[PDB]
């Protein structure tokens, strides 16, 4: 039902969205409808961190989610708790969580660089993107893993 509603919103159709929501309402209880509303809004407020959920799911799941950024692969590969992954590293056509930068104090900057020469670069204002190229197959991914390939 959620897939139908999302695709149908993407297709510029509202009568079908109304039908799907009506079916969900008619075939749900008050608590189920409340939870469904929370998932639609994309907030649950469970009080438990996503990192905790991933850790309980498998020993090495946060790293795999960072490298891949797709709940399907993490859920599929990490099924048997005993069986782990030998080596996890960036792979083609799979979004990876970008590496960010933290505030720095000009006074102790040299100390933060272990008293060694460093690189100074200009700050760029705009979107953060990553490009995957294999032959003439191109994929573009945004900061959080959304696919912007259609635009570019």
Partner DNA sequence: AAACATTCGTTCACGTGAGTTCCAGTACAAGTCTGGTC
Pick from 22, 46, 104, 129: which binds DNA (CB under 7 A)? 46
**Does 50 help bind DNA (rule: CB under 7 A)?**
yes
Kindly tell me which of 49 and 122 has the beta carbon lying closer to DNA. Answer: 49
Burial class of residue 73 (count of CB atoms within 10 Å of its CB; 0-12, 13-18, 19+):
middle
123 labelled catalytic = yes
Query: In angstroms, how far is CA 71 from the centroid of its own chain?
Result: 8
Kindly tell me which of 54 and 141 has the beta carbon lying closer to DNA. Answer: 54
Nearest of 96, 74, 76 to residue 145 by alpha carbon: 96
Name the active-site residue from 19, 111, 123, 139. Answer: 123
**Of 15-23, 32-40, 43-51, 119-127, which part binds DNA (CB under 7 A)?**
43-51
Provide the CB-side half-sphere exposure for 57 (13 A, CA). 19
């Amino acid at each position: 039902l959620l897939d139908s509603i999302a695709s149908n919103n993407s297709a510029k159709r509202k009568d079908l969205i109304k039908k799907s929501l009506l079916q969900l309402i008619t075939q749900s209880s008050a608590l189920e409808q409340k939870w469904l509303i929370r998932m639609i809004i994309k907030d649950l407020k469970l009080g438990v961190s996503q990192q905790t959920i991933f850790s309980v799911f498998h020993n090495d799941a946060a790293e795999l989610h960072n490298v891949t950024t797709d709940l399907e692969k993490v859920c599929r590969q990490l099924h048997d708790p005993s069986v782990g992954l030998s080596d996890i590293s960036i792979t083609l056509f799979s979004a990876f969580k970008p590496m960010l930068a933290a505030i720095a104090d000009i006074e102790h900057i040299e100390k933060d660089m272990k008293h060694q020469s460093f690189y100074i670069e200009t700050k760029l204002d705009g979107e953060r993107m990553q490009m995957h190229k294999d032959g003439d197959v191109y994929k573009y991914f945004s900061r959080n893993g959304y696919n912007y390939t259609d635009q570019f």
